């Protein structure tokens, strides 16, 4: 087999990090003083990947510059990394389509995102995938990696929770869905018809967002050009099983760690896990990205101390604290469960609880910081309290004597930030008639072409298997009722004549094409008689209505004479002077 390859999408095509991601890509955000790209590159290198492709679109220049100075771009790195940039990328589907276009891969590559923290060794999963592919002759197209977990774990965010129904004896994924906002899950019966021997429903799987894929995956992505996410591919493939089977299998790990950073909740959870050595050997003191700045020593209660930290007198580090190089801590401080970047300056009598400080953060004396994030070079003035879930972006200062609420997100960009930040704190046939009327109303507003309008009317008639005589009656009734809608409550004949003018002229080709036979003309006249009788308030203008049919050639001159000759109550209405005058005028004008 050829050397193992990997496609590393270095751009999340979704903005879950405004306003933080407005000046720094999510891929370059420091988790434990080390960027996420470094973690995922180390994971790829440690598992045997020998060739990696990074596809970065948003702020690709910064990612390129950071990568070129990294360890993996050295000539001595066994994991060769290729950097491909393009502004046209919009989704992971675009990346896979480009991979298939340039034919980057040859067989059984790795699909991971650029923010995946893991220590998983995929040797067993890769061997199982290859053996299954060899035995089934190119049926299994993907092998997704999952981690055994519990629904109550902090890593199990509500957004990315997933329930999967699988075949327990072959590890084949039969159904896959997300549980965001759902209090009750549903599974189609088509799962049980094939693998009736064994079916399991698993909710204890954490999605590591790692997949072992085949070039057939890229081929399917470029076949269905509308695919944008891996979930779209999985769903569309699992629903289209009768043809192009192309089944998907899975692998479950129990003693290994893997999770992707999608939001601040996942960021905090993964940072806490990394500090507490849950991703061994990817520990802060391991210095897996060899550099002079990120060296530190591990002590009791998971205390990581860098060079020249210079802790003050009386300050207490409780547990799970990482201190960067060049940091300065005051006196009588209390830092716990916090990560502090290099070069930070901390005042006296401060309290830090589950907080994260990036490079250059300066904190004045007496501050109280709990469960908040402080980006690069953020500053806090004297006696400021930050309630949980607070975010301070880069170059942000907070004035003295203020207690930011429990959701404060402030940056130098006014719109995206919830508060602009600065050196201060504050400041049966019935449906057919309705459809015909709806189409006619929509067509008139949008000025629909006669040929297009005729096709739509014909399509509806053929769909409902409507008859020819019924269609003529329905068309006349719908058109006549539509002219009545022009006047709200006039109940006059003048309004009916005004409305029937534009309707007859604009829709003349449609009526003429539909009403051509003599029998249809007789049916149309009968429908007009019912319409005139049902609208006797507007029926005084029936003479104009009769003239309109002759003028538009929908009803012939003999048709009007035949309708007038045939009679009763309707004949008395047709015996009026206005009706008689129209017949005499039409006969004389014709000849």
């Amino acid at each position: 087999p050829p050397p193992l390859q990997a496609v590393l999408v270095a751009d999340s095509f979704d903005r879950r990090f405004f306003p933080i991601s407005k000046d720094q890509p999510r891929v370059l955000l420091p988790l434990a003083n080390v960027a996420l790209i470094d973690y995922t590159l180390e994971f790829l290198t440690a598992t045997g990947v020998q060739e990696t492709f990074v596809f970065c679109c948003w702020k690709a220049a910064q990612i390129k510059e950071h990568l070129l100075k990294s360890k993996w771009c050295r000539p001595t790195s066994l994991n060769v990394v290729r950097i491909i940039t393009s502004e046209l990328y919009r989704s992971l589907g675009d990346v896979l389509r480009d991979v298939d276009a340039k034919a980057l891969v040859r067989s059984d590559f790795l699909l991971v995102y650029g923010d995946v923290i893991s220590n998983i060794n995929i040797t067993r999963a890769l061997e199982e995938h290859r053996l299954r592919r060899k035995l089934e002759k190119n049926v299994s197209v993907m092998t997704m990696i999952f981690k055994e977990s519990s629904p109550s774990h902090p890593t199990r965010c509500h957004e990315d929770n997933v329930v999967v129904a699988v075949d327990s004896t072959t590890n084949r994924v039969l159904h896959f869905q997300k549980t965001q906002g759902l209090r009750r899950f549903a599974f189609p019966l088509s799962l049980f018809q094939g693998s009736s021997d064994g079916v399991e429903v698993r909710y204890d799987l954490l999605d590591c967002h790692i997949s072992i894929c085949s070039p057939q995956v890229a081929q399917l992505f470029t076949d269905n050009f509308d695919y944008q996410t891996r979930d779209d591919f999985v769903r569309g493939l699992l629903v289209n099983e009768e043809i192009l089977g192309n089944q998907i299998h899975m692998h479950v790990t129990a003693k290994e760690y893997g999770a992707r950073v999608s939001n601040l909740h996942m960021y905090s959870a993964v940072c806490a896990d990394v500090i507490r050595r849950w991703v061994y050997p990817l520990t802060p003191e391991a210095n897996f990205t060899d550099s002079t700045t990120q060296s530190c020593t591990h002590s009791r209660h998971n205390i990581y101390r860098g060079p020249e930290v210079s802790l003050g007198h009386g300050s207490i580090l409780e547990e799970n604290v990482l201190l960067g190089s060049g940091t300065v801590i005051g006196s009588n401080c209390f830092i716990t469960n916090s990560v502090i970047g290099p070069g930070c300056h901390i005042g006296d009598n401060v309290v830090l609880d589950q907080t994260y400080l990036w490079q250059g953060v300066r904190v004045a004396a007496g501050a109280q910081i709990h469960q908040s994030l402080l980006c690069d070079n953020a500053e806090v003035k004297e006696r400021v309290t930050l309630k949980p879930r607070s975010v301070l972006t880069s170059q942000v200062v907070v004035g003295p004597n203020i207690t930011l609420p429990e959701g404060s997100v402030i940056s130098l960009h006014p719109p995206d930030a919830e508060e602009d930040e600065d050196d201060g704190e504050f400041s049966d046939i019935k449906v057919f008639q309705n459809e015909v009327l709806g189409t006619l109303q929509r067509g008139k507003e949008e000025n629909i072409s006669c040929d297009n309008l005729v096709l739509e009317i014909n399509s509806l008639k053929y769909a409902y298997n409507i008859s020819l005589k019924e269609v003529m009656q329905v068309l006349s009734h719908v058109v006549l009722e539509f002219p009545l809608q022009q006047m709200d409550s006039p109940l006059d004949s003048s309004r009916y004549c005004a409305l029937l003018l534009p309707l007859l002229k604009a829709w003349s080709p449609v009526f003429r094409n539909y009403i051509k036979r003599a029998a249809d003309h007789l049916e149309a006249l009968a429908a007009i008689e019912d319409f005139f009788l049902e609208h006797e308030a507007l029926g005084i203008s029936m003479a104009k209505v009769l003239m309109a049919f002759y003028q538009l050639e929908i009803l012939a001159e003999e048709t009007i004479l035949s309708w007038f000759s045939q009679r009763d109550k309707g004949q008395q209405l047709r015996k009026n002077q206005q009706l008689q005058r129209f017949i005499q005028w039409l006969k004389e004008a014709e000849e």
């Binding site: 491909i84 940039t85 393009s86 046209l88 389509r97 480009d98 276009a101 340039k102 190119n138 081929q219 076949d223 050009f225 509308d226 569309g236 629903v239 289209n240 043809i243 192009l244 459809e435 189409t439 929509r442 629909i448 072409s449 297009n452 096709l455 739509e456 014909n458 399509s459 509806l460 008639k461 053929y462 769909a463 409902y464 298997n465 409507i466 008859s467 020819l468």
Partner: protein, 410 residues
């Protein structure tokens, strides 16, 4: 055994010079991919087996089936290629984007039921446009057959608005249908004097694994020719060519030049290719650029076709209000085409060129569709617009190209 030669100037549709395939006839019916048995009984089962690979677009590719009609120790009178794709929506979208496709139709109606499939077939036949309906409900009682015929006549009475006046009624029915087709099918006017133009719908790599350096054949493309006649040895060019974006800029397309080293139909074809069939023009192209279905979507020109490479197209459209002929029992907003949402991927289908395009902007009369790959069709042609509602691409509307972005790389 035929005796095709290489001496012809002005051939005809019914001329015996080709005698392989000159007229393409569609086949849309309620068989639901069951028309294969009828086609085999009319044409042949194993007639088409010359190049196989891993199928990619099973339900989005139009398939042909060559067949020669013989009459009166029999002599071949006419040859027609039967086209039948899975799903009438794709065929309807392809046919109603210009002309020179599916000159004839055969409505495979059923005498057992009158389900919504017949209505959809009738709507597709009306939208696409000489039809010839036929009922395959064999093994029925005489009274049952008469009742089915009466029901079919009642349906055809309404269907005759556009074209609903055919007549047809195991191999005896096939023979009767063949005789009726031979008697009724008219010769369509095809411009043989124009420059040849071929649209690729199937690509192959004939070089088997572990082959020697001597028997190394490659570049065996395929597809259909609309206007013109292709002659072996001519210098042909691919309008799309090879598209690369590694230059850190806009997409650059370099056309590929080759020579027609062969021309193969289902049987052994001559050095000249005629329109109205599936002719595989095997050129001198490297198999690496033409692997299994890796060249589909390119137009193989001859004299440098004027159609430039288009990246984005401004198309004025008339979106259809509802699904054409689809009125289910529920119809809970399923048969209702919504407005053109921004950043939505739609299947632009210009003639037989199936490509993908996302909507970038629109103001109430015209959208600006950015295509997933460049195309070379025209500057004012009619481009259909489709979109899937549930795992099935379906027609949504029409379009007329008004402007575009041109790419002209050397």
């Amino acid at each position: 055994l035929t005796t095709l030669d290489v001496t012809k100037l002005t051939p005809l549709s019914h001329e015996v010079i080709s005698r392989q395939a000159t007229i393409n006839i569609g086949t849309i019916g309620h068989v639901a991919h069951g028309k294969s048995t009828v086609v085999k009984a009319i044409s042949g089962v194993h007639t088409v087996r010359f190049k196989n690979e891993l199928e990619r677009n099973i339900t989005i590719k139009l398939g042909y089936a060559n067949a020669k009609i013989y009459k009166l120790n029999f002599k071949l009178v006419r040859h027609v290629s039967f086209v039948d794709c899975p799903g009438h929506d794709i065929l309807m979208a392809t046919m109603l984007n210009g002309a020179a496709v599916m000159d004839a139709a055969l409505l495979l109606i059923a005498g057992n039921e009158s389900c919504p499939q017949p209505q959809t077939s009738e709507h597709l036949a009306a939208i696409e446009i000489h039809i010839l309906i036929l009922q395959n409900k064999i093994d029925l009682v005489k009274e049952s057959q008469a009742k089915e015929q009466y029901e079919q006549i009642l349906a055809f009475v309404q269907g005759t608005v556009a074209e609903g006046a055919p007549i047809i009624p195991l191999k005896y029915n096939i023979e009767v249908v063949c005789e009726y087709i031979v008697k009724k099918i008219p010769v369509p006017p095809r411009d043989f004097t124009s420059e040849p133009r071929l649209i690729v719908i199937r690509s192959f790599d004939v070089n088997k694994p572990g082959c020697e350096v001597d028997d190394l054949k490659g570049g065996v493309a395929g597809g259909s020719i609309l206007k013109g006649v292709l002659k072996v040895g001519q210098e042909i060019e691919v309008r799309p060519g090879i598209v690369s974006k590694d230059s850190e800029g806009k997409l650059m397309c370099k056309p590929i030049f080759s020579k027609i080293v062969s021309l193969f139909a289902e049987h052994n074809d001559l050095q000249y290719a005629a329109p109205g069939g599936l002719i595989g023009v095997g050129t001198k192209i490297d198999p690496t650029l033409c692997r299994a279905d890796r060249m589909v979507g390119q137009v193989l020109g001859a004299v440098g076709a004027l159609p430039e490479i288009f990246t984005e197209l401004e198309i004025s459209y008339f979106l259809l209000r509802r699904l054409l002929g689809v009125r289910t029992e529920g119809d809970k907003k399923a048969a209702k085409v919504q407005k053109l949402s921004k950043n939505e991927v739609l299947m632009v289908n210009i003639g037989s060129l199936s490509t993908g395009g996302r909507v970038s902007a629109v103001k109430a009369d015209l959208g600006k569709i950015v295509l997933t790959n460049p195309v070379c069709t025209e500057v004012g042609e009619k481009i259909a617009l489709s979109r899937r509602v549930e795992k099935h691409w379906r027609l949504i509307g029409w379009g007329q190209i008004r402007r575009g972005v041109t790419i002209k790389p050397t």
